[PDB]
Design a protein around this ligand. Structure first.
Ligand SMILES: Cn1cc(C(N)=O)c([C@@H]2CCCNC2)n1
Length: 152
């Protein structure tokens, strides 16, 4: 059958919202009021992959855009990128592994681990106006847990 998807927003556990910071970067900042329209709306697709009660493979596309969050090596390091795809072919149920995150329930919140790079997570910084990135160090003040808000 088709792939199933939900529209949603994400905020980090410090309650920063995610906005596009150019065509291919996301940044996290504290947002409230009129400026909340700036936040990115995701289409979260429920994709093929290893699954358990608390760990659900997803892709994170930008709603109304042929753009997906993507985990690749860049200058020999696992990195988060926004990658363009052929809009005729996406979303699909068998997304390529660079596009897959394991959405994990953690202490009433959500973590997004790279399926491609075990124990690398979608991360934000403490400071505002910094990129969303793929973090692979568990020590430090980087934020790896989020809440989801459902969108019409
Ligand atoms: C058509 N469209 C979809 C999205 C999105 N997936 O976030 C957008 C952004 C929303 C934030 C304001 N700029 C444009 N525009």
């Amino acid at each position: 059958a088709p792939v199933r998807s939900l529209n949603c927003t994400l905020r980090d556990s410090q309650q920063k919202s995610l906005v596009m910071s150019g065509p291919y970067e996301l940044k996290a900042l504290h947002l409230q009021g009129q400026d909340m329209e700036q936040q990115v709306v995701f289409s979260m697709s429920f994709v093929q992959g290893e699954e358990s009660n608390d760990k659900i493979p997803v892709a994170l596309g930008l709603k109304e855009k042929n753009l997906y969050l993507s985990c690749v090596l860049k200058d020999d390091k696992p990195t988060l990128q926004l990658e363009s795809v052929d809009p005729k072919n996406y979303p699909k149920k068998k997304m390529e592994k660079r596009f897959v995150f394991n959405k994990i329930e953690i202490n009433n919140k959500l973590e997004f681990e790279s399926a491609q790079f075990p124990n690398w997570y979608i991360s934000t910084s403490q400071a505002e106006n910094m990129p969303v990135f793929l973090g692979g160090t568990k020590g430090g003040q980087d934020i790896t847990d989020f809440t989801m808000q459902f969108v019409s």
